[PDB]
């Protein structure tokens, strides 16, 4: 088949907010993962369970590219067993996560003069989320100015999840 | 932010020949963060390339864009009569968004052509109206790099001299004309007025006089 529409996800004409993150499914296509891990346009590329170079060998039933937009310093929150506002009340990865987290600076794309507030996050919640949960019921705006420091600038992020079903495999590498 | 500097400024080539334009950036931009444009005289511009290496909807394959980082290229492999225009690179990477200065793809397959030089004194009508303008015409020449000098008697006039820039023709030679605005007093108190031209060597001269 054709290439898996990684392009469409990894770079869409602007992304969605973190609290109401995007849950895009990728199936029935040939997936070259080298196109991704060979690129130096990322300031973050971490993997869990499996090595990203080995994925060209491997087949999966489905592949889910969860994507969102967060602040700066919080990129390390996007991980298993982590703590913080985002890992608690917005987006949480499981302790036994089998996938890869990729992020990059988007100050040029998602900051405005006087601030770009249309990006939000959940501040208050009575308890913490379960792995891969989204609440959509209170909240707080980020407010990205281009004049900010590295830690306070917007970072678009995508997380790949590889599904291991006892069902026909549709997403394989070269 | 970012400053853009194309090169060269002008490119004199023939229908059939190959034409390549570079575009230099002050800061880095990824591959998929650049576009190229064409502008024919007296028209809204036209998109050619986007994402540095993606052709626009229905662009011929003779047009090909490329490059990376801060150095980018646009190649027209088989120039046509329609490929004459000003060509602008334009970066989309960071904010602000910026445009390049613009490079003129000039049509040379023409040899060195000396201009026809003709001269016209003020209309008696204009003189009655208390003003005196002289017109010195230079047309059908190549290339568009030229100079003109005015003479009150045997002495050069300095101010009141405004000239129309290289107005390119359909036969792709050029045309330019100079205006000299004076008073009726000054026009009448000098025995003769001259117009000197130097185009690629030869210094030609023409003359008029109040009879």
Author numbering:
A (entry chain A): 333 to 469, 491 to 527
B (entry chain L): 1 to 27, 27A, 28 to 210
Sentences copied from the publication:
Here we determine the diversity, potency, breadth and structural insights of bNAbs derived from memory B cells of BNT162b2-vaccinee after homogeneous Omicron BA.1 breakthrough infection. The infection activates diverse memory B cell clonotypes for generating potent class I/II and III bNAbs with new epitopes mapped to the receptor-binding domain (RBD). The top eight bNAbs neutralize wildtype and BA.1 potently but display divergent IgH/IgL sequences and neuralization profiles against other variants of concern (VOCs). Structural analysis consistently revealed diverse modes of bNAb action due to their distinct binding footprints on viral RBD or spike proteins.
The structures revealed that both antibodies interacted with RBM residues mostly outside the ACE2-binding site (left). RBD binding of P1D9 involved CDR L1, CDR L3, CDR H2 and CDR H3, with its footprint shifted upward on the RBD backside compared to P2D9, which used CDR L3, CDR H2 and CDR H3 (left). The binding residues of P2D9 included G92, D93, S94 in CDR L3, S52 and N58 in CDR H2, and N99, Y100 and V101 in CDR H3, interacting with RBD residues including G339, N343, T345, R346, N439, N440 and K444. Clearly, the RBD binding epitope of P1D9 overlapped with that of P2D9, but they were not identical (right). In contrast, the potency of P2D9 was not affected by F486V alone, similar to some class III antibodies (e.g. LY-CoV1404 and S309), and therefore could more potently neutralize BA.4/5 compared with P1D9. Aligned structures indicated that viral G339D and N440K mutations could form new hydrogen bonds with V101 in CDR H3 and G92 in CDR L3 of P2D9 (bottom), contributing to its neutralization potency against Omicron variants. The heavy chain of P2D9 might be pushed upward in the context of mutant RBDs, which might explain its relatively reduced neutralization activities against BA.2, BA.2.12.1 and BA.4/5. S371F and T376A mutations in BA.2 and BA.4/5 sub-lineages could shift the position of N343 glycan nearby, and therefore, conferred partial P2D9 resistance.
